[PDB]
Design a protein around this ligand. Sequence first.
Ligand SMILES: CC[C@H]1OC(=O)[C@H](C)[C@@H](O[C@@H]2C[C@@](C)(OC)[C@@H](O)[C@H](C)O2)[C@H](C)[C@@H](O[C@@H]2O[C@H](C)C[C@H](N(C)C)[C@H]2O)[C@@](C)(O)C[C@@H](C)C(=O)[C@H](C)[C@@H](O)[C@@]1(C)O
Lengths: 97, 64
Amino acid sequence: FEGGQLPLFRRLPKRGFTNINRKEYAIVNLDQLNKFEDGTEVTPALLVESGVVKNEKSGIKILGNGSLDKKLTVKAHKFSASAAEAIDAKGGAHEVI
Amino acid sequence: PKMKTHRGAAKRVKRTASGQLKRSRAFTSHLFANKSTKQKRQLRKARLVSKSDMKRVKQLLAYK
RNA sequence: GGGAUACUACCCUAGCUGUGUUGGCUUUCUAACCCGCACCACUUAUCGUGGUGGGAGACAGUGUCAGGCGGGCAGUUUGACUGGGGCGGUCGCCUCCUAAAAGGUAACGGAGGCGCUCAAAGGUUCCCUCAGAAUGGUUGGAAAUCAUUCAUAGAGUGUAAAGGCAUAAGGGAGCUUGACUGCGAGACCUACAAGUCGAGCAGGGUCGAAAGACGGACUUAGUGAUCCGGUGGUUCCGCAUG
RNA sequence: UAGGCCCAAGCGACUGUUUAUCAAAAACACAGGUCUCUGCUAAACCGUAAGGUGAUGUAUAGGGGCUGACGCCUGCCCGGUGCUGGAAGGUUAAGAGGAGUGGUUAGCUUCUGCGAAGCUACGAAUCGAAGCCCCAGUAAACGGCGGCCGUAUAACGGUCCUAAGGUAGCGAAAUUCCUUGUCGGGUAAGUUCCGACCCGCACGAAAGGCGUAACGAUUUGGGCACUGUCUCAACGAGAGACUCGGUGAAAUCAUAGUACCUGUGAAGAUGCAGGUUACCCGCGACAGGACGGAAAGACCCCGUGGAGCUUUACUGUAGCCUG
RNA sequence: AUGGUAGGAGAGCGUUCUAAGGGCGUUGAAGCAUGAUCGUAAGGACAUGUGGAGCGCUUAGAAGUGAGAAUGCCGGUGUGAGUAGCGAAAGACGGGUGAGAAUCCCGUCCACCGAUUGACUAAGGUUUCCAGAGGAAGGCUCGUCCGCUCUGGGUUAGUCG
RNA sequence: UGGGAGUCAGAACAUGGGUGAUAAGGUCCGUGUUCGAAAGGGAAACAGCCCAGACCACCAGCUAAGGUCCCAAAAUAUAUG
RNA sequence: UGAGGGUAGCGGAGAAAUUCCAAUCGAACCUGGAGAUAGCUGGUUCUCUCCGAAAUAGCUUUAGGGCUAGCCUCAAGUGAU
RNA sequence: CAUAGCAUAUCAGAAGGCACACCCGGAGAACUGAAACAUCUUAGUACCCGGAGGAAGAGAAAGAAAAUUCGAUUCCCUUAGUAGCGGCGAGCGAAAUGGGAAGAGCCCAAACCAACAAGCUUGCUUGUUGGGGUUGUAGGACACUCUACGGAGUUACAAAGGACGACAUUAGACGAAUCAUCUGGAAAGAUGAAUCAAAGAAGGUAAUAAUCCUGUAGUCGAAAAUGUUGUCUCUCUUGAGUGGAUCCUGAGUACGACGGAGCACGUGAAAUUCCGUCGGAAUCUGGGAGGACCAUCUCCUAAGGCUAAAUACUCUCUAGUGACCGAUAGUGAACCAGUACCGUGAGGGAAAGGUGAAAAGCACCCCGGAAGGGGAGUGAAAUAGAACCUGAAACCGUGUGCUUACAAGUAGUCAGAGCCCGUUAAUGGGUGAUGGCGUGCCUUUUGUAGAAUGAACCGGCGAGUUACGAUUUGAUGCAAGGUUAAGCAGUAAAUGUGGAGCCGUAGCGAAAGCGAGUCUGAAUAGGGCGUUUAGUAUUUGGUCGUAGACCCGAAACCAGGUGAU
Ligand SMILES: CC[C@H]1OC(=O)[C@H](C)[C@@H](O[C@@H]2C[C@@](C)(OC)[C@@H](O)[C@H](C)O2)[C@H](C)[C@@H](O[C@@H]2O[C@H](C)C[C@H](N(C)C)[C@H]2O)[C@@](C)(O)C[C@@H](C)C(=O)[C@H](C)[C@@H](O)[C@@]1(C)O
């Protein structure tokens, strides 16, 4: 309440809508995968067991922020281009579940 | 009991990464012919809620 | 000739056959229904119930829906500033003075304007330049038009006033629509919302021989959020799927 | 113990009734008038209704409105509003008709419009009573009864416009701003009173006009009687009072050893300054101050505070009328 | 460096209760009263009287945690003050009773109401009626008196309502 | 940058101005001071004027504004009018 | 004028005065909603230390209220601005 | 005639009062907030009425959902102050999913069959009885095929009604162990020496007791009883599987139009579910739902009924508990309480506790009419004497040391003689001739000695609190991770378990989506938000929000009742 001056949230206009069925993905970067061993095959269940992912929301997504310095195979729902590239560069495979 | 959210503000503003609130611009949605194209395109640029207004409306959006 | 009888609603002027049946008008019927209607019994009893006779009658009455009227009744409203209040006047924006040589600065302090206009009164390229004054003459208003010379903006500038203008920002002519799209480092103003100016970068254009100038008018007023609703495009989203 | 009287103006006819607790009156009632409604399960009223009053009445009756005995009277306007009636001219919602238009589908060319059969949402061509518009009437219905210039529709003239512009009778009035209007009477002296005048700011005919005998704890003016009302106060009788004996409250109250003058100061001082006066303590009396007591001012302003009433304020509504 | 109201920050004193530890108390606890004591403050001890059973200290922890004002609420008590008032009216004397008499009983005189200060009956009240006893409270004074207190008694209907 | 406030009745004096009447202890702005929220000394008393900003003791001293006849501390001082 | 009865608060009664309805009436009284609401008034309890304002723009059915800025305080940080 | 109606015989089935606290229906406000107010909100709240009950209500898919699905109903934690509704304002506010408590599916109508009576002529129909069966990737009848007490279940669906084997084993009973001295009026205290403990809980006793009393732990115990518990006589249900071709599968119903209400949804596209008025169907090749409507898919099969548990409240009862009160507190009420008292009435509504261990409660004498007292006496104590523990201040008095009748006063303060006294013994105390200075406190104010407010005095009582959530500071633990909620086991604790969920580890964008980048843009350009580490859990303080929200105070509004003495 501003004393009768029109409040800010009526001076301003509304915009947008919410998508009720929106996909959000559990995020994991390459720097988190360095804890594993070379040649290992990582999966969502193995991620959860290792504690890297507390909650699989709509799938798991691999992003290329950090540096890998490893060689392993990965099975996930979505990947980023940089992530797949940096996986295959050191050796390894990405299998879209 | 729980605090309640101001819904009119909720569907007028969003929260940025650090702590700030990003808003939409007024003086749209109606007569532009009196205005210039410069004003038109510049009222499409987003802005932030001012801190003087945050000091007043902070509690309305705590759950945002 | 003023229509107007090809074919065809078709027809006033026509009279005109009855039709599965349906849908309106007006009378007449009665068993629905109604009679604070008459007699007779329950009865002890004018309530009420029942039989008989009379009235009225598919109207009335009642339900639901719609329209009109409705201070009879109800809930509410009926602004602020103000040398007390009231009456009066005013309420937003622009320009001067007040304002004390930065900016800003009050009063029911002193003066005025805006609530637009323009397809050229915008852009560009070329050219051009005051009134007034006398001088002097057909006209002559003495002065309108015409002609020489000083005139310093006292000319003129769409619109109030102020700041500016011969780079003409004033006056004409030729082309043309930059009165475009998307951004904009950075700055002014500012409680917020807002408002103001911008080099320059891409894109694709106009004028000009070209450098280059053009993101509306010499500048500053010519509006007003939000919610709601309407119109056109869309790469967006939605219901199990389309 | 047991009526004061006379003369003259208003108001109201009279008897009556009224604000228990500041108003008894000119206010209300009244008997008489007038208008309007009502044909009986009357109208009107109470109630959701059933049942009731009206009325065990029936237009010489009943309800409502205005006026208010009696006498003389009661003028102009139907343009506007209301009420009544009529022509019915035209406008409408719910409703009956569905002519046509689209979403969708094996349906038809499979690159695509019979929309077909069908499921579906829109939809005028018509009418559809009230109301509304229009016409007439109604003023003891609501209301109105003049602007302009000669002049203080004053006198007569015009015009302005709508529908008309004040008849009788009253008139410085319970009504007259200027106003103590002017003239006369009454008094030695008359802002009142009486009578007369009309220049009615702004009288007027049933929100009745004018007048009226009788009546009035009514208003008003003058006179006689009479008196301590007064010049002008005096003396007496009781009760309080005062002294004594018994009994014994209350309002109020920051603490108090509580003076006056001139100044000062929140602009009016027991308490401050400078001076003046003043031995301590009582009783009877007075009322100038303590802005004395009493009552969180009732006048005035404010509050986006309340309540009551009004209406052509907004929004509704019981209810009524019509389908 | 250290004046200070709205106000911000900080450090502390006390009150009741709880935990733990360690203590005091009929050779007298808490409360109350007095004192010339200690601490920068809130405040803390000691001594003596009174009283006659519970209470401190240390550390921490919880709060119904501190009053001079609200025309505050409840109780006590003042002031005004020996003041106002003691509610319409004729009493006087003698004798008596008694601790005590203007006020109670008896007697004489006097006076008042007298279409009433009289006598009945309803309503209402509900034992205030009658004998004794009583003077603590009530009686606007007093009191030997009383509609007050205590004890005990009292209302009789075929015809009255 | 953030946590917590309170405030939105202002007054006089001096100076620059409007208004008013070159009136107001008037009113409205601007520039400074004081009071507000500031005791102390002076102006007789006197929020706003002059001096000057109180941590606490002292029967110590130097000064400010204002003063030195008595009230009532200090010159009945000097010199010249 | 008496005794029995009747009319009840969005109501009744009124020879009409806002008059009466249990010492009250422009809408009675008792309970409850109810600790209604009160931008208004009053009040709000122990001590010391440090710092220490404002009475102003701007918007406001706004004017003795409120919001943001100004000016106060506390804590981190930058670190000559 | 017939029945109404009337008249008898039998039974006692109901009324009223509930604890209207909880539950279900009918009816249904206003103050208030929105800084006015009308949609909205307060709120389907308060009040009123009716029902039942110990619980009530709901309840077994014409569902929820879109996985590869799921468990009838109810309740708790989350989802989430999300999605959504909204003068899109104030504000209102889900659900699914998931984790858990408790866990239960049973019966009708209709088909069909076999008998019974009347019409009819026993053919059929009607109705009565009995079987049979009540469900969908379709169930049943008819068509098809071979079995029953194996299990045995009274909380519905049948029942042992059973010898049924501690109601709580409940009134009740038993229940270990101490002497002495000192002080004392009296010891439980001090001192010293002993003892019991499945009992050291508590309270009384002349003061503070494990061993004095009542008791406690524990043991033994009976009526109404059974704990309602274990084979428990009878009785139970050992299933009959395929196609479903034909028949049946709840009518003035579903559904629609109009007007309304309830659902988180503001009445409208209302999808979904109810009321009133008008219309009004389909029948398994059927019908309904999946937020207008059409088609394809998925799920289900309405218009019939019953149903325990987990859950809600406490006028009561039994046994107990408390960093709850301790007589102005705490119930209004510790006592004479819903009583004195007030009011016509509905209704309102107080004050008021304490002798002492023991009544041993003052024999007797004296003054006095008595009340009162003074002695004596009881007692530890009588200034403990019933107006009885302690006994504060205001207020009222009596005695005295200093002082005062020439003095102008916010009554004190600094100075200071004289007089009197003699301490928590320290450069002491009391009084005060006289001099100087000096206009109370609080609140409100530009400013108050103010003739502005408030207080007669004294005492007592008398105002930022708690819950939940947010934010920010301090503390601690762990750390790319941190953390549990409900529930369960446990002493109404700590703790243990419980990983559904929550925050963070990545943001940008309306969104699809992309991703250390993204959005814009035609473009990567330019710019905005971002990256280039640190959070999380509990708690402390400060502040805010929702609740009465620091306390007292209106005029008034509404609902239900009381009054015409
Ligand atoms: C007999 C018994 C009564 O006497 C009166 O009424 C007298 C006769 C009033 O005279 C007056 C007489 C009359 C003319 O006024 C002068 C009239 O104007 C007022 C209303 O009552 C008084 C005094 C009034 O004062 C005045 O009230 C005025 C509102 C303001 C005035 N002000 C200047 C302080 C103040 O003094 C005020 C209202 O009565 C006093 C209040 C407390 C009362 O109501 C008191 C208790 C009365 O009941 C009174 C004692 O009983």
